Design an enzyme around this catalytic site. Sequence first.
Site, PDB file in Angstrom:
ATOM      1  N   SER E 106       0.833  -1.195   0.000  1.00  0.00           N
ATOM      2  CA  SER E 106       0.000   0.000   0.000  1.00  0.00           C
ATOM      3  C   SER E 106       0.874   1.254   0.000  1.00  0.00           C
ATOM      4  CB  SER E 106      -0.948  -0.002   1.194  1.00  0.00           C
ATOM      5  OG  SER E 106      -1.468   1.300   1.427  1.00  0.00           O
ATOM      6  N   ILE E 107       0.767   2.052  -1.061  1.00  0.00           N
ATOM      7  CA  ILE E 107       1.479   3.322  -1.106  1.00  0.00           C
ATOM      8  C   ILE E 107       1.012   4.223   0.030  1.00  0.00           C
ATOM      9  CG2 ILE E 107       1.655   5.444  -2.420  1.00  0.00           C
ATOM     10  CD1 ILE E 107       1.858   3.906  -4.894  1.00  0.00           C
ATOM     11  N   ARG E 108      -0.302   4.295   0.243  1.00  0.00           N
ATOM     12  CA  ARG E 108      -0.827   5.195   1.264  1.00  0.00           C
ATOM     13  C   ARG E 108      -0.286   4.843   2.647  1.00  0.00           C
ATOM     14  NH1 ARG E 108      -5.371   5.208  -2.685  1.00  0.00           N
ATOM     15  NH2 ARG E 108      -5.703   2.982  -2.180  1.00  0.00           N
ATOM     16  N   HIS E 220      -8.706  -7.196   8.430  1.00  0.00           N
ATOM     17  CA  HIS E 220      -8.209  -7.949   7.284  1.00  0.00           C
ATOM     18  C   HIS E 220      -7.344  -9.125   7.694  1.00  0.00           C
ATOM     19  CE1 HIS E 220      -8.848  -4.853   3.826  1.00  0.00           C
ATOM     20  NE2 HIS E 220      -9.878  -4.907   4.654  1.00  0.00           N
ATOM     21  N   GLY E 221      -7.325  -9.470   8.982  1.00  0.00           N
ATOM     22  CA  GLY E 221      -6.585 -10.621   9.439  1.00  0.00           C
ATOM     23  C   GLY E 221      -5.232 -10.330  10.032  1.00  0.00           C
ATOM     24  N   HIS E 224      -4.969  -5.843  13.675  1.00  0.00           N
ATOM     25  CA  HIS E 224      -5.654  -4.604  14.035  1.00  0.00           C
ATOM     26  C   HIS E 224      -7.049  -4.527  13.424  1.00  0.00           C
ATOM     27  CE1 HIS E 224      -3.748  -3.452  10.185  1.00  0.00           C
ATOM     28  NE2 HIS E 224      -4.768  -2.623  10.052  1.00  0.00           N
TER      29      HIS E 224
HETATM   30 CL    CL Z   1      -6.018  -6.110   9.599  1.00  0.00          CL
END
Ligand code: CL
EC number: 3.6.4.-
Lengths: 313, 313, 313, 313, 313, 313
Positions: E106-108, E220-221, E224
């Site tokens: 992820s660039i962001r 997303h696993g 967090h």
């Molecule tokens: Cl996550």
Amino acid sequence: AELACFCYPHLENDSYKFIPFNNLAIKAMLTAKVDKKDMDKFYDSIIYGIAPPPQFKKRYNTNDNSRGMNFETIMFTKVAMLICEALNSLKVTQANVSNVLSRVVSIRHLENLVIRKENPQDILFHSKDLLLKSTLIAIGQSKEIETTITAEGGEIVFQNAAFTMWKLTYLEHQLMPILDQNFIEYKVTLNEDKPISDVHVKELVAELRWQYNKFAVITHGKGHYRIVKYSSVANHADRVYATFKSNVKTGVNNDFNLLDQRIIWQNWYAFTSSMKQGNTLDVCKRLLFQKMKPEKNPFKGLSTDRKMDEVDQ
Amino acid sequence: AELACFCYPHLENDSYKFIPFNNLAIKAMLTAKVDKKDMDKFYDSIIYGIAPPPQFKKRYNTNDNSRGMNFETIMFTKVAMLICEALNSLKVTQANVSNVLSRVVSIRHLENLVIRKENPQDILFHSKDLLLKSTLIAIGQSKEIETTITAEGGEIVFQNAAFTMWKLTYLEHQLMPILDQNFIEYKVTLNEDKPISDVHVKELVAELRWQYNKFAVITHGKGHYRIVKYSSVANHADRVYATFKSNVKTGVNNDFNLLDQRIIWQNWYAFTSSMKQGNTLDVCKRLLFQKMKPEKNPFKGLSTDRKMDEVDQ
Amino acid sequence: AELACFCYPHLENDSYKFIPFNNLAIKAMLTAKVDKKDMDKFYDSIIYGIAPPPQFKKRYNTNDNSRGMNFETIMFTKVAMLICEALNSLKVTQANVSNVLSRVVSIRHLENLVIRKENPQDILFHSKDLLLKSTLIAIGQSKEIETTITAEGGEIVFQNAAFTMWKLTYLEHQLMPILDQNFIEYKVTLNEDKPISDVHVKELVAELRWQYNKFAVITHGKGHYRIVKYSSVANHADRVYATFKSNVKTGVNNDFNLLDQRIIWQNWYAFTSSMKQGNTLDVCKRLLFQKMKPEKNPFKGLSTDRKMDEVDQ
Amino acid sequence: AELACFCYPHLENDSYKFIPFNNLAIKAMLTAKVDKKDMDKFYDSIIYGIAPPPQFKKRYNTNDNSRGMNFETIMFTKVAMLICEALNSLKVTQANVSNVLSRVVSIRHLENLVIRKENPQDILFHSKDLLLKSTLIAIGQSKEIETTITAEGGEIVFQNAAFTMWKLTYLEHQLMPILDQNFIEYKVTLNEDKPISDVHVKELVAELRWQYNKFAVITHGKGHYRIVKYSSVANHADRVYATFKSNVKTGVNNDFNLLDQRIIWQNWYAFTSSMKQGNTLDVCKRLLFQKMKPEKNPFKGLSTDRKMDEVDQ
Amino acid sequence: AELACFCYPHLENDSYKFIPFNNLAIKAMLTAKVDKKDMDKFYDSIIYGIAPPPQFKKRYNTNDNSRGMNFETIMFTKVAMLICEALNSLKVTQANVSNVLSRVVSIRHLENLVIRKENPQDILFHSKDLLLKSTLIAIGQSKEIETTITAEGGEIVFQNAAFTMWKLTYLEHQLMPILDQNFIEYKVTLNEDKPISDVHVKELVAELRWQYNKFAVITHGKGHYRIVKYSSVANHADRVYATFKSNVKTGVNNDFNLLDQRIIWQNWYAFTSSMKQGNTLDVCKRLLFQKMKPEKNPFKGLSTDRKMDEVDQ
Amino acid sequence: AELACFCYPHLENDSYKFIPFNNLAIKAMLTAKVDKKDMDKFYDSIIYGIAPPPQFKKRYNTNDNSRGMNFETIMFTKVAMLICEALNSLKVTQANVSNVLSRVVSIRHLENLVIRKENPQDILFHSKDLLLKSTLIAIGQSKEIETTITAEGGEIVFQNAAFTMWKLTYLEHQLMPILDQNFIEYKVTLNEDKPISDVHVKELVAELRWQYNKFAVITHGKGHYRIVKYSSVANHADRVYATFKSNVKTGVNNDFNLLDQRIIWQNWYAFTSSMKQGNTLDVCKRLLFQKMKPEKNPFKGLSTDRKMDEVDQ
Ligand SMILES: [Cl-]
Ligand SMILES: [Cl-]
Ligand SMILES: [Cl-]
Ligand SMILES: [Cl-]
Ligand SMILES: [Cl-]
Ligand SMILES: [Cl-]
């Protein structure tokens, strides 16, 4: 530019009425493919009405041309209306209509007339006959001489009982301004035709020597003085002689008022006198570039009188 | 968008009169909770009058939607007035009123008509019958073909005795502009229905080859040419074929003018001819993507004639 | 302009070192009264050091002159430093110093070199020998040919294994920009001296036909192509022939690389070949203005291959 | 203003070192209540150090005073530093320190020196001895004559082998600008002390007659010419005579260089010669206001030579 | 985007060092003609060094593409440096270098790491090992779990002994911002790995119910929580399942931490549990779209406790 | 503020006509010295007509007061005209005129009425009787209940067959805006007096729970709901109870519509019911601050229905 750049004729009631162009009609014209045989004919934009003949393309500023006019400005509309109003005061016939439209006149003279007309302080705003007179002169449809009352206008920088000196604010014009920022030109019109006293001539020569010493007093043969900087005198001579030579070949009236010999610069008086004598451009131009001085200081130490006045002031 | 996005009918004097929406009425609608059974009914905002059916929600730009229209702009009001004025020139009956409102038309075509109408230089500003005609075509309530006189408008970039080429300035529109800044589209309308000479066809092909070489000359079957860049031809084919297939199933008139074979790009002439022959989208599309060249250079070295003209210029 | 417009020589250690002018020194010069016998001598401003010979007055923009250079800008200082740095890498003797300073070179080429040098992304920022090489070519103190590595710069708009096409951004320059806003010029340099495959020539001709169809591929005889619009080809021919005729009379090297016959426009290949044959300007120019087509499409339907690629895209 | 307006003395190592004031120290002073017996003493602001004697209040611009100086500007600091640097190059003793601080000098002359010193193009930026020399003259702690090298500065508007003409840009100054927007003043300094040829005097008189005809060539008795408009000559005479009368009563050197009789305006040469003869202000002033012309045109028709040059140009 | 979009490898000392691209090198690449066989090879711009493989063209924003990255911004350079610094802390061998560069990250996430690193207030500015750790996680070259200390950053909107809630300010990013202005996303990281008390879980659920009621708590696993609005949950499920299905086919570690069942939304806990059970996307997605409520209010009337607190406040 | 702050009575034709104040009359008043015995009398500014009684000084914003109104704005004039127009529709007698002027009404309610009236899209712009009705309610000279048609206005954020929810844009007001930037207040008016179905109540409770979860649904006893954030509920209770207690002591009508028990927050329903029962402020307020939940979720999992709708959306 030619009057045909601003309007087209309409045959109404056996006379001609003149209609200003829509600027988008000129735009459509400037993009159109025209056969050379129609290059001289009025163009039909379909959407925006009639447009000027395409032969007049370079009178219009585009990305290709900066030596035309800003036809999409509102001053284009105002100038076209001014012309149409004057041309319609004449009931132009089917004979003389081509000649009238082909007449080349100064746009900048016309923009300045509009500036005068729209100002409530100006006499031309209040006398439609005076506005009519001034326009007919600027268009070249009047043998009358431009005086102060009928002048193109500008900023009054000196006035006398006899003369009014105008600054030609051609750098600020909207329609066809002078692009050269070094441009400065002035114009001295006569207030009346009553003869001018020696005292009043002296006051004008005094102001020119003091305030405009870097300027040459000349004239193009109409009834007024043109105050130009000497760097431009040579081009004025060319333009003046060419008109002289042109209308002497085309048989037009060639009346050239040399004006007061004590006010005009001497080389200009010499070059134009030789012009009226029928000499070549070379003989006339030679007189323009040669030291002759002095002819006379017609009034002595004018500059020193002004100087002592400033010292006291 | 559908005409029902701009106005609602009012039964006056046994005929229907059409009233533009207040934009705040649309705002209230876009916030309202509506039962699915009323999703097709005109909405009452109480404060601002009647609003469009909520089924048309996504024709309106919100924070949720950038693919609708800017209904709160003044151009929305102007377009709605333009539509209402045309729909009221027809005394629409209780039968045909649902069909008329459900008609999908190009908003951008209508904004350009408004732009023409509000310009004093444009013929449409002066002939309410011509404006009426042009709108009735854009709305799809007229079998008449859009010509130059009735065109949506834009910037004239080339004109002939036969053709006028317009630039579709859809990037600058207020109501529903094209969002893609790479968008460039042109449109060539016919000035008359008099037949067009070979010399005048040649001049238009010459300008297209020289000035628009990266563009494909096509048409959607109405009476005019559409100058699109080739990156978009595939989508034009889809949109065109779909309309063909749709109105052949719904029984609407399917008149498709393939226009001049020497002007239209060859693959477009091939893909649309096969379309008129009743073939599948696949067979037609295949013709669109295959090298065929040349069909003919109908006029030879047009590009080189223009080139030598520029060199001399 | 001449190199003497940017710097003056200083005899240090029996060699010459070159010093940039202070711009206020040039200002003082432009106001100074100089005898005609010193018009060719370096001017002493007393306050700001040595200034260029007054004979170079019109290389400097004033209110009188818009066809010179903006010598008071910081780009003037940067260009003068660039020149001095290269001229000092040569230990110029008392003999050849007058010839070096009188050399006329392209200012715009030098401003673009400075733009390259000050950019950390550019190779010239990192190799002072490469910067030295590129400057010595632009100044005309090197028989080496400008390639991609040593190019003046600009915006890369197309690159190949063989070629790099640059846009000459001369409208944005600070020191001596092109004033004509219609100016567009491109430049194709060779990346190596390894021979270029037919596939790589084809790709460059393809891009030129598609993307620059309104442009003529020409060359001034150095090792690179110049992509100019056809409205300017005639002036390029004049400038090119004049240099040919000049240095053939002054005995300078006259090496003219006609470059690839399949890339250069045919009239240009014809006009320059006849130039190398020793013909008159008239015979050469005639070849420039005559339809010859076709010489060959060296690669067939290149434009149609690109077209089908765009349609698919 | 007096030098005591910019700095105070500090006894270091049996010599005096001079320290610039903090501008907030001057602010505190301007608000302070001081007994008349301390009105001549250096003021202690406690927070910002020593301040000028309160007797100098009206040298400082406040809301009450626009005829002082802008002491809170950074130019105040730069001028005070310039003065201190020069005063510290002299090892001023306990005897002469009161006399040095009471010296009234031209602030505008000092701001222009700072402008010269901070410019890398100017010689004064590079020679601290030349800057020292120029400041010591402007402060009045040097019998040396201001020449071109040591001039206060300005814009060079004409240069010769013999003369440099500067425009005094006193309208743009930060510390103590001229408030009268009609102010225009020029200054002609001598480049050397080698005698000046007749040809070089002629060139300077030619430029003055042509370009500065509304200006009087005068001098205050130092080694340079002052080009003032005639509306100010009377005040210059008063200021000049008053200094003459003052320092003849206080026994200071009264050397008055009348300078070239062919360059100075005749009334000025007359009024100042009579001044040196010891006459009353009235007898001298009378000579200033009387027509005398001509003394001689020392060089004939200079104005006409320039005029024919412009016509050809 | 792939790491190969930011840097290229250099074989130094038998290990690989990574070098950021010059943005003008990417510009040259985006204009270049490349054979399909070299579409995967690093490109040589000659002037600006090595550029990414042309197969990565659409990761770069052009006029053609708004779904890439703003590679000419300075944030591109900062992100490329951040990546290179981390990749160089690993002595990457000739084997694993292709795999590392092909990694999509992820660039962001990386722009936010740079924002943390350049802030003196942030711990990452002071611990290069912590910055190294956080980057290695964001790049995917670390099995370690992102916690609060190693978080990408953002604005802290709620903190606990156990959790820190960050607002992802992706609308303000420079390199690759979210274009959809309706975007709002939050992120809850764990401060430690010490077990979290029931009181601290309750405080986080309380804040989510009160302040973020229109948001779904998912994950997303990784370690967090991701606070997304429900309009986006479906796309999160797709992206999550696809990664699950992908790396189960490519044999990569598939560790999915479902996190606290009392914090995660129930449908998300259901859809991801079924995901871990190996079910089809359809069976999992069904669980996502079905009313199940309630699972339990794990803590009762949390919302009412907060409400009475606000009433008193 | 009191109606006497906006206008004064004039005895015309045995009835009273009301005249708005000039704002400069109020300015003169605010500077005037008035005896305490005239503090309640209309003030004469001589220059600008009659002004309000000086006892109303702090209703006017000065440098001393930010809790008054901006009486010099044009909205002051518009509100005063709105009041006068309504007060003149009543032929107020010499008896009831003091009572009418002493009436305290919400300025912000009146500015919003003006905003409605000046909008052509709004019904109030077109029905002067509806505007009259809405004003008479806002002024308190009408027993009629404010409904949607007669509402003060604002931005419609949700509409039903039964309800319209308005946002009170009091931060943007000109005359007397809310200064606290944390202010957010909403208002739900009834569209008709036809009974409201359970389905339509459910839709409004659904929107409030989802979109305004941090807000308390309450009412001041008129016919509409007030959506306030819970941080303000305590002050609303005080203001409500005080009015209850006041007009029960002054004998005014005390009709308090508790409105739908399923829509109003439970503590508000409890605190106001106990209010109507005649209890002390303490007993009522206690009910306001105590957990009671739940009363019932009158409609179950409304929030979850909306949630699944968003997930699908
Ligand atoms: Cl996550
Ligand atoms: Cl004349
Ligand atoms: Cl069509
Ligand atoms: Cl070349
Ligand atoms: Cl002096
Ligand atoms: Cl209420």
